[PDB]
Structures are given as C-alpha cells and as structure tokens.
Amino acid sequence: AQYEDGKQYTTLEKPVAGAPQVLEFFSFFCPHCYQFEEVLHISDNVKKKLPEGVKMTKYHVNFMGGDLGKDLTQAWAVAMALGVEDKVTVPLFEGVQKTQTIRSASDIRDVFINAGIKGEEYDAAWNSFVVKSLVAQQEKAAADVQLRGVPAMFVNGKYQLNPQGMDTSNMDVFVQQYADTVKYLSEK
Numbered sequence: 001a002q003y004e005d006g007k008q009y010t011t012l013e014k015p016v017a018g019a020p021q022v023l024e025f026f027s028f029f030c031p032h033c034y035q036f037e038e039v040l041h042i043s044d045n046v047k048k049k050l051p052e053g054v055k056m057t058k059y060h061v062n063f064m065g066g067d068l069g070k071d072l073t074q075a076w077a078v079a080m081a082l083g084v085e086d087k088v089t090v091p092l093f094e095g096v097q098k099t100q101t102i103r104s105a106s107d108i109r110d111v112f113i114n115a116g117i118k119g120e121e122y123d124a125a126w127n128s129f130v131v132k133s134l135v136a137q138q139e140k141a142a143a144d145v146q147l148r149g150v151p152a153m154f155v156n157g158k159y160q161l162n163p164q165g166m167d168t169s170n171m172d173v174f175v176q177q178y179a180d181t182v183k184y185l186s187e188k
Contacts, residue, residue: 007165008181012158016144019148019157022050022182025142028096029064029074030150035108037093040175042151049179058085059138061150067097071105072096077134078112078125087115155185 005011024043028034036042047056060076062069072092079085091111095102102108112122125131145154153161166177 016157023154025152027064
C-alpha cells in the first residue's frame with residue numbers, strides 16, 4: 001500500500017474499546033511536544049483535516065518531571081475544566097522548557113493568573129472533584145494503551161501514529177503527512 005502498518009502507524013495488539021476518537025498525549029517536559037505544539041502545530045493541522053463530527057482529545061502524562069509532572073497533569077485538568085487550554089498551553093511550555101521559571105505548583109498557578117483566570121476560580125477548580133476525575137481520566141487513558149513515551153497519538157483505540165517513519169527534511173511536509181495519516185486512519 002501507501003499506508004502500511006509498521007510504517008506511518010503501528011497497530012495495538014490489545015485494542016482499546018470506547019476510546020476517544022483522536023487521542024493525543026503530551027508532557028510539558030517533553031521536548032518534541034514543545035516542537036509539536038509551537039513549531040509544528042500538529043493538533044491544529046490534524047483538526048483542519050479530520051472529517052467532522054469527530055472530536056479531538058489531548059491529555060497530559062505523569063511519567064516526566066516527577067512531582068512537578070503530576071502537578072502539571074492536575075493543572076491541565078484545570079485547563080480542561082475551565083476551557084482555557086488555548087491560553088495556558090504556550091506559557092506552560094515556555095515556563096518549563098524555555099525560561100525555566102516553572103519550578104513549583106505556585107509557579108504553574110502564576111501562569112494561569114497572568115493568563116487571566118482568577119485565583120479564586122483557579123484554586124476552586126484545582127481542588128474540585130470534577131478535576132480529580134478529569135485527572136483520573138487522563139491517567140486511565142494513558143494506562144489503557146501502555147503509554148511509556150510522548151508525544152503520542154491514538155486513533156479509535158487501535159492505531160498509533162508513527163512519526164519516525166515519515167520524512168522530516170521539510171517541517172510542513174512532515175505535518176501534512178502526519179495529519180493525512182490521521183485522516184486515513186480516521187476513515188479506516
């Protein structure tokens with residue numbers, strides 16, 4: 001074919017029922033995730049090519065950056081509950097990896113305050129049980145698919161994107177190939 005198992009994607013030996021249609025995993029500690037987010041805008045270019053009536057989910061993971069890693073997964077859960085993913089994603093990445101000014105939960109909280117979420121509203125969300133389950137969901141979905149590395153994309157719990165098997169000479173070309181692959185897998 002032109003799209004072969006083991007080449008632009010791999011297939012899960014243990015498929016995952018009821019999974020989100022397009023499921024992406026990242027870490028604010030993950031260097032390629034930074035690339036994927038602010039240089040390549042993968043999430044965004046995938047969205048643009050998906051059929052629709054298809055929803056896109058993105059989750060943070062715990063296995064990078066120890067204690068601060070977990071804090072970031074809760075903070076992402078807060079982002080998700082308040083719907084402020086778009087206002088914090090970039091300063092969260094740059095605070096962990098570029099400026100290195102995120103060193104504690106409090107520094108994470110600063111990013112939200114500066115992004116305009118209110119302390120009262122952030123602390124309330126942070127501590128809410130809706131956020132607890134949303135953390136639980138994030139962990140469960142990573143658990144369901146044997147996740148040991150990020151970035152990672154899964155399409156209906158049975159296909160996993162394999163970017164090592166795509167050309168990287170041209171970034172735009174890598175992105176199109178990536179998204180088209182998601183689209184092909186979407187339709188499968």
